[PDB]
């Protein structure tokens, strides 16, 4: 198989909206949230049973007026490999999730 | 062999490059981030080993907002290998990681 | 010649409070200019943001950061000085 | 009978600060208690962190955030009130 970019971003979305959909920021909880978000996709794109290796990251940053900055290049084979990023605000925190799809 | 202790230094050398000894401000920031990722990449593809490489680098004004990350990955648990390092000044928390994988 | 009335902070920082106060006292004649002197001097050294009030009969209710507040007499001039924001 | 010397903020807020202070200035007789009453009341309404001075002789160098500063007299009694941090 290969790496459908939609069949990850639709799969990420659910994750995000599951874990942190319907609650604001709170320290005693955040890290267990990110913990889930990621260990949630993984549980989904491995059920998927593709000949792929994966990497999956989550940011969550409080909205307080700090200035965040993303940067991410890689070194794969552009034809076999691909990656999906996804961005998700509420009122009290932004959030960024990025899964990568390297082949064996 | 994914020499993690050695590729440790490689990342800490992505501060002896760009303004990894100045201070932070908005209009000039996205010059650094991208470049930190770039230079750390060349010095393992120059080595042309049988690895692929993903590499991310993140920057957040030291304002007093909370910051949290997640590192779930799925690979050959003997040849494939990760390295993440942290560096901050008085302006900014900075945080970088890189992933090598097989074949 | 100082009389400390109420102190939170710093000994060493306590000093630069009195020390540079004593200076404004002799450099400037008007309460407002004294204030401005001590404020800026402290914004510079100890990082924003500070607030100075100088007078003879005033009253005050303020919120400061732990270990960044002082209110003291120089001669018979009230000097209040604290960080908040 | 209240003169506004300098204001940043805000009709309603302004006139609310004014009409408050007057209450303050008839319940309480001690200058430091007048400040107390106003500072407290504002944290309640308009959110921390406010600061108040109430005096006949004083000057001030202060730093506030936008549309949250006021400085007026009630007869002779001057009120400084601003938000910061």
């Amino acid at each position: 198989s290969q790496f459908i970019v939609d069949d990850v971003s639709k799969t990420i979305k659910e994750a995000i909206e599951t874990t942190i959909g319907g609650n604001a920021y709170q320290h005693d909880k955040v890290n267990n949230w990110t913990g889930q978000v990621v260990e949630n996709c993984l549980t989904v794109l491995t059920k998927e049973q593709k000949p792929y290796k994966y990497i999956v990251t989550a940011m969550i940053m409080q909205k307080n007026g700090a200035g965040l900055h993303t940067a991410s290049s890689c070194y794969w084979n552009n034809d076999t490999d691909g990656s999906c990023t996804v961005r998700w605000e509420n009122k009290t925190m932004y959030c960024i999730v990025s899964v990568f799809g390297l082949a064996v | 062999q994914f020499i993690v202790d050695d590729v440790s230094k490689t990342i800490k050398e992505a501060i002896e490059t760009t303004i990894g000894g100045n201070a932070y401000q908005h209009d000039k920031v996205n010059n650094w981030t991208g470049q930190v990722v770039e230079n750390c990449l060349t010095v393992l593809t120059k080595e042309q080993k049988p690895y692929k490489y993903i590499v991310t680098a993140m920057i957040m004004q030291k304002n007093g907002a909370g910051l949290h990350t997640a590192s779930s990955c799925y690979w050959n648990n003997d040849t494939d290998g990760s390295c993440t390092v942290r560096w901050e000044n008085k302006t900014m928390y900075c945080i970088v990681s890189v992933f090598g994988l097989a074949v | 010649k100082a009389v400390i009335k109420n102190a939170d902070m710093s000994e060493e920082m306590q000093q630069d409070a009195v020390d540079c106060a004593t200076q404004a006292l002799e450099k400037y004649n008007i309460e407002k200019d004294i204030a401005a002197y001590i404020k800026k001097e402290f914004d510079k050294k100890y990082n924003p943001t500070w607030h100075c009030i100088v007078g003879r009969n005033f009253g005050s209710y303020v919120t400061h950061e732990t270990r960044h507040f002082i209110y003291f007499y120089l001669g018979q001039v009230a000097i209040l000085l604290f960080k908040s924001g | 009978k209240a003169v506004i010397k300098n204001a940043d903020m805000s009709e309603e807020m302004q006139q609310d600060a004014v009409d408050c202070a007057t209450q303050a200035l008839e319940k309480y007789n001690i200058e430091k208690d007048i400040a107390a009453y106003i500072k407290k009341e504002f944290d309640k309404k308009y959110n921390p962190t406010w600061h108040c001075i109430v005096g006949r002789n004083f000057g001030s160098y202060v730093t506030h955030e936008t549309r949250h500063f006021i400085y007026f007299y009630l007869g002779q009694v001057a009120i400084l009130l601003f938000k910061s941090g």
Binding site: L42 | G66 | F58 | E31, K32
Partner: peptide
Amino acid sequence: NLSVYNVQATNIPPKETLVYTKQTQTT
């Protein structure tokens, strides 16, 4: 073969420097 991994990690919450509330008057 292919497996899952950690989870390092990073977590840095806020701090909001403390603050006290003191009142003063003059003699």
